[PDB]
């Protein structure tokens, strides 16, 4: 059978961190799943362009650092680049 494959666990694990007193309605879970899913397609789509725009075969942290810098607006871009470098810094040791 098919399976829903949603981000619902992880958006809830994050809500329970940022507002421990607060819950998610089933329709707001839909909006959050849509937002995560669309931003993944937007970033991975631009990363696939950015690889072929340099005729590189891989995608790595630099392709996605570039895609974040292009796709995100002001303060969110530098914050997302900071979070990506922090997670990769911990992951690489």
């Amino acid at each position: 059978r098919s399976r829903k494959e949603s981000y619902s666990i992880y958006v809830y694990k994050v809500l329970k961190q940022v507002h421990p007193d607060t819950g998610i309605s089933s329709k707001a879970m839909g909006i959050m799943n849509s937002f995560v899913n669309d931003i993944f397609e937007r970033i991975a789509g631009e990363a696939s362009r950015l690889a072929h725009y340099n005729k590189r075969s891989t995608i790595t942290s630099r392709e996605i650092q570039t895609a974040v810098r292009l796709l995100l607006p002001g303060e969110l871009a530098k914050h997302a680049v900071s979070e990506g470098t922090k997670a990769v810094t911990k992951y690489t040791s």
Binding site: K27, G30, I31, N33, S34, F35, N37, D38
Partner: protein, 80 residues
């Protein structure tokens, strides 16, 4: 048959009042109905082409969501 007139005069009043307009000249209704119908027509045609390609009779929520991505006028919360 004649269903474009089913967008009722109070429904236009309310939808325009959510849009914040103060006075509706009675000239507004039929052009607003036609404009709406043409936006529906584009979204429906696109959704029907996805449905025809998918070898499928039923138009799904995914087909209208993909038509809204194809038109760059996206809608979150219906899945995807």
């Amino acid at each position: 048959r004649d269903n474009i007139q089913g967008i009722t005069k109070p429904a236009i009043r309310r939808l325009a009042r959510r849009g914040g307009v103060k006075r509706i000249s009675g000239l507004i209704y039929e052009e607003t109905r036609g404009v709406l119908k043409v936006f529906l027509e584009n979204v429906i045609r696109d959704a029907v082409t996805y449905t025809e390609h998918a070898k499928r009779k039923t138009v799904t929520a995914m087909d209208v969501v993909y038509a809204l991505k194809r038109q760059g006028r996206t809608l979150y919360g219906f899945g995807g």
